[PDB]
Amino acid sequence: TAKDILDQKINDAFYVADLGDILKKHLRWLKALPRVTPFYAVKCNDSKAIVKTLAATGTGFDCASKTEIQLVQSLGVPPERIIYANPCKQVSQIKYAANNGVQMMTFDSEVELMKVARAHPKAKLVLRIATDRLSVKFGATLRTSRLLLERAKELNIDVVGVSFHVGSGCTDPETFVQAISDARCVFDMGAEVGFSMYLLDIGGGFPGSEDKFEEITGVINPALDKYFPSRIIAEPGRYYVASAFTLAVNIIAKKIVLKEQTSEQTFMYYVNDGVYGSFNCILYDHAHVKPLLQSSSIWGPTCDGLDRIVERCDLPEMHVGDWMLFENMGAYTVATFNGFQRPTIYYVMS
Amino acid sequence: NLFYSDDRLNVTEEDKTRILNVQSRLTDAKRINWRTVLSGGSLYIEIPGGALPEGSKDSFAVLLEFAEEQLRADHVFICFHKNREDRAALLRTFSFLGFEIVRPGHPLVRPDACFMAYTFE
Ligand SMILES: Cc1ncc(COP(=O)(O)O)c(C=O)c1O
Numbered sequence A: 001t002a003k004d005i006l007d008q009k010i011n012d013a014f015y016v017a018d019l020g021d022i023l024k025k026h027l028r029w030l031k032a033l034p035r036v037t038p039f040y041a042v043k044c045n046d047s048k049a050i051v052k053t054l055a056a057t058g059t060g061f062d063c064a065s066k067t068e069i070q071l072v073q074s075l076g077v078p079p080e081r082i083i084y085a086n087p088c089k090q091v092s093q094i095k096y097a098a099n100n101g102v103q104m105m106t107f108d109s110e111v112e113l114m115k116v117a118r119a120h121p122k123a124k125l126v127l128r129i130a131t132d133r134l135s136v137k138f139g140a141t142l143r144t145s146r147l148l149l150e151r152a153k154e155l156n157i158d159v160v161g162v163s164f165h166v167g168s169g170c171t172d173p174e175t176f177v178q179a180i181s182d183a184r185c186v187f188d189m190g191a192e193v194g195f196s197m198y199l200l201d202i203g204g205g206f207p208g209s210e211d212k213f214e215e216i217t218g219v220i221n222p223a224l225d226k227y228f229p230s231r232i233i234a235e236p237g238r239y240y241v242a243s244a245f246t247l248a249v250n251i252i253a254k255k256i257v258l259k260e261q262t263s264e265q266t267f268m269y270y271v272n273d274g275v276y277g278s279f280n281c282i283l284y285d286h287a288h289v290k291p292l293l294q295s296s297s298i299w300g301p302t303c304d305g306l307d308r309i310v311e312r313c314d315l316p317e318m319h320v321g322d323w324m325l326f327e328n329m330g331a332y333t334v335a336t337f338n339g340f341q342r343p344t345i346y347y348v349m350s
Numbered sequence B: 001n002l003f004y005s006d007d008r009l010n011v012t013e014e015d016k017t018r019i020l021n022v023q024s025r026l027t028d029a030k031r032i033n034w035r036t037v038l039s040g041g042s043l044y045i046e047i048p049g050g051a052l053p054e055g056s057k058d059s060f061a062v063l064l065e066f067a068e069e070q071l072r073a074d075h076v077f078i079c080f081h082k083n084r085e086d087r088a089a090l091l092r093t094f095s096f097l098g099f100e101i102v103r104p105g106h107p108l109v110r111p112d113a114c115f116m117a118y119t120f121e
Helices: A005-009 A019-032 A048-057 A066-074 A091-098 A110-119 A142-153 A173-193 A213-227 A238-244 B058-062 B087-096
Strands: A014-018 A037-041 A060-063 A082-084 A104-107 A124-128 A159-163 A199-201 A232-234 A245-257 A266-271 A296-299 A308-313 A323-327 A344-348 B010-013 B018-024 B032-039 B042-046 B054-057 B075-081 B099-101 B113-119
Touching (some): A005 A245, A014 A019, A014 A238, A019 A037, A019 A344, A048 A066, A048 A238, A060 A066, A066 A082, A104 A110, A110 A142, A124 A142, A142 A159, A142 A173, A159 A173, A173 A213, A238 A245, B018 B058, B054 B058, B087 B099, B087 B113
Parallel strands (some): A014 A344, A037 A232, A060 A082, A104 A124, A124 A159, A159 A199, A266 A296, B042 B075
Antiparallel strands (some): A014 A245, A245 A266, A245 A323, A296 A308, B010 B018, B018 B032, B075 B113, B099 B113
């Protein structure tokens, strides 16, 4: 399919994105999650095209910054589809969201609460809880939850629901079913502290490649029909955009290393896209990217110690000037001048 | 030398540029201090030995009120050795906050240490 348009440009790192894969995956979504309303975590990929198709279908948008609600408000999306769900929210951001009609704002601590109280006190707060590996802890614990639920009243702020987020690398569905359980308990103490709760947000983390979805979604559906039967939204990201993109990188340096004891030829290729540019994954989530063509190790443009895309892979010789490919490079591979790059994306909508 | 103190913070100072020792007397938490340094708008927090004491981010989040509001910082950078052993989990967690990894050589930053930069809005 679009796995040729690459070649049509082969004659400086660039993307091609199957903009249909975005749609079929959304179709796959509401066929697997008919009850849940997906809200795109735009921080995953803030490319306008990716958003504009998604918005035009029927997905909400979990935004996390000023520029992000801009992108999504400019596309004429009604502020009733926007949820501001940044873990740590700056004050000016609370205000901007207030001045612009966005109402759903998350929280998981009293620190976040005070901030909301003096910037946007009339917001619809959704208490993010902590589903059971990361440094700091995110989400409230079942106890502190209650204290937040009371404090919200003792401040007179409307809490309208709860949220969680198991995130990536969840290696067991019994984690999802548990949060929804804890999400019930929290709904209670809220209804008990006197809140007309109605919004359950289950966050995001569902995979976007085939390396599974329905497996995670199928332990969910009986859990929602259980604890929450008769509103449910989500905050997916990696799901939608992963398998859509394919990165094309050009070899820009070649070196041969021998290591003789007393007999081992090995190649090193340097490309024009690195771990500080696109491949944030490998030092973030410790990815394992396999390279495609048309023994070695692939390194990045910055001559840095850990600008190492792949450390060891069996690969025929080159020379310089060749392109290599990486599939499923759509999630968290795009961002800018801090911090600069900007590549070019080729959207292919069949 | 009594820089700043409110209900949640206690930042004493160390000496030019201006180094800050911000400390969170949070509403119920243990003691969390962050040896930071403010140099020309931007502030540079150094990240402790790890693992992190149970208080942050509630502490660190306060460390972003101030300095956005008192130090009027446009940039807040964090740094840790590289090394360490949880560089991943570290890189990952702070990224959940509006942070991002900084490509070496930037004008606002040694090679033994890994940086990350959060910009305000
Ligand atoms: C609150 C929230 N929702 C959604 C996401 C992104 O979800 P996903 O893991 O599918 O990219 C993030 C970060 O993981 C997040 O912090």
